Amino acid sequence: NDVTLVTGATGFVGSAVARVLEERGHRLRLLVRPTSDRSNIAELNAELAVGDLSDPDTLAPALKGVKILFHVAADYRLWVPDPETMMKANVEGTRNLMLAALEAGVEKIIYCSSVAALGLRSDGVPADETTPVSESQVIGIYKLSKYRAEQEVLRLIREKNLPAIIVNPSTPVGPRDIKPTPTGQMILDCASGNMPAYVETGLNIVHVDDVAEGHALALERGKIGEKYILGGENIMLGDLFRMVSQIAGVKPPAVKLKQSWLYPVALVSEWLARGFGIEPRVTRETLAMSKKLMFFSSDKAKKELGYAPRPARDAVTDAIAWFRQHGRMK
């Protein structure tokens, strides 16, 4: 009657979301995989349900007696040999979960999505929940997957009155980055001195604990059918590495490749594929999309939810302090 189910709780975001809910005193049930590793888990007094999103039979048991569902992705950019197969399984998995929660009579669903599902501006002014997005401008399987999944949730919200509120975190950094996420691995390589080169670009960094808190705020004050960007700070990658290096007491990376220098590679790529009669993975048309800065505003969640992200330097600082104490810099 009173159970909060969170999925993806072994992940970086999932577990931080779980901790927040716990300190707010929800009764937790955590869906985990048959495989799965309960390491940043045992910390939580929590019911554990075992299940798997691709098979709707194991989900009803887990959603019995559940009032509130937080759907958080199991991983965050987990590399795989089969990316197209993973995108189908993740899109369908989300659909099964959403339909199952609907069927079990869950009252409120908070769906964790991502800025990767959202649109971009070209003039370098930060994008928001209103920026138009089209399938034809999405560039990789990671983003395409987040885009398709988010579109599924919006279809179910409209066609079937799914009581879902959507959250779109930017790129979370912070302590407890166990696998390291890709952004963690970059911060680690850099803090360690072993990152000689990099390709410039723009991203938005957000403390993982702020993402977490923002999920709780969406449950408390968010409106069914709305998306809310959960960003922190719009930062260039060079500036990020400047901060990492200054905090870690090390030399910043020597080599900065401008994105416009990838143009020739794009061109060669188109010529190789043509010459071989295959599809290029990368083209000039590809580069012109990925050139855009990934800059987002969190103003909608600021006004509408009282979301208060701490600055990017705080997230980077904690992530490094944690990496040092936990042996990751060796």
For its own copies, the binding residues (CB under 8 A) are 35, 79, 81-85, 87-88, 134-135, 138-144, 182, 197-199, 201, 257, 259, 262, 265-266, 271-272, 274-283, 285-287, 289-290
| 217 near Hg ion (CB under 5 A) | no
| 218 near Hg ion (CB under 5 A) | no
| 44 near Hg ion (CB under 5 A) | no
| 190 near Hg ion (CB under 5 A) | yes
Question: Locate tokens 């987002």: which residue?
Answer: 296
Closest separation in Å from C-beta 79 to its own copies = 6
77 vs 258, which CB is nearer to Hg ion?
Answer: 77
| 73 near Hg ion (CB under 5 A) | yes
How many chain residues are in contact with Hg ion, going by CB under 5 A?
A: 7
155 vs 324, which CB is nearer to its own copies?
Answer: 155
Question: Locate tokens 């929590």: which residue?
Answer: 46
Q: Quote the strand ranges of the chain, DSSP E.
A: 3-6, 27-32, 47-50, 66-71, 108-112, 164-169, 171-173, 197-199, 202-207, 227-230, 233-236, 255-257
Other C-beta atoms lying within 10 Å of the C-beta of residue 110? 23
Residue selected from 5, 32, 68, 112 as contacting Hg ion according to rule CB under 5 A: 112
Closest separation in Å from C-beta 102 to its own copies = 19
CB 191 within 8 A of CB 52: no
User: What does the alpha-carbon distance between residue 141 and residue 83 come to, in Å, rounded to a whole number?
Assistant: 7
Q: Quote the strand ranges of 108-178, DSSP E.
A: 108-112, 164-169, 171-173
25 vs 264, which CB is nearer to its own copies?
Answer: 264
Please report the DSSP string for 290-307 in residue order.
HTS---B--HHHHHHH--
33 vs 291, which CB is nearer to Hg ion?
Answer: 33
Tokens representing residue 84 in the block: 């197209």
Residue from 219, 131, 176, 200 nearest 11 by CA: 176
Q: Which does 253 bind (CB under 5 to 8 A by kind): Hg ion, its own copies, none?
A: Hg ion
Q: Which does 117 bind (CB under 5 to 8 A by kind): Hg ion, its own copies, none?
A: none
Query: What's at 117, amino acid-wise?
Result: A
Q: DSSP 3-state assignment of 231? A: coil
Closest separation in Å from C-beta 17 to its own copies = 22
CB 320 within 8 A of CB 186: no
151 vs 245, which CB is nearer to its own copies?
Answer: 151
Q: DSSP 3-state assignment of 237? A: helix
| 316 near Hg ion (CB under 5 A) | no
Distance of CA 43 to the CA centre of its chain: 23
| 17 near Hg ion (CB under 5 A) | no
Closest separation in Å from C-beta 274 to its own copies = 6
Q: Which does 112 bind (CB under 5 to 8 A by kind): its own copies, Hg ion, none?
A: Hg ion
Return the C-alpha torsion angle 67, 166, 23, 4, nearest 10. 20
Closest separation in Å from C-beta 1 to its own copies = 33
Closest separation in Å from C-beta 251 to its own copies = 18
99 vs 139, which CB is nearer to its own copies?
Answer: 139
Q: Which does 220 bind (CB under 5 to 8 A by kind): its own copies, Hg ion, none?
A: none
User: What does the alpha-carbon distance between residue 236 and residue 10 come to, in Å, rounded to a whole number?
Assistant: 30
* Residues at the contact surface with Hg ion, assessed by CB under 5 A: 73, 112, 114, 190, 195, 245, 253
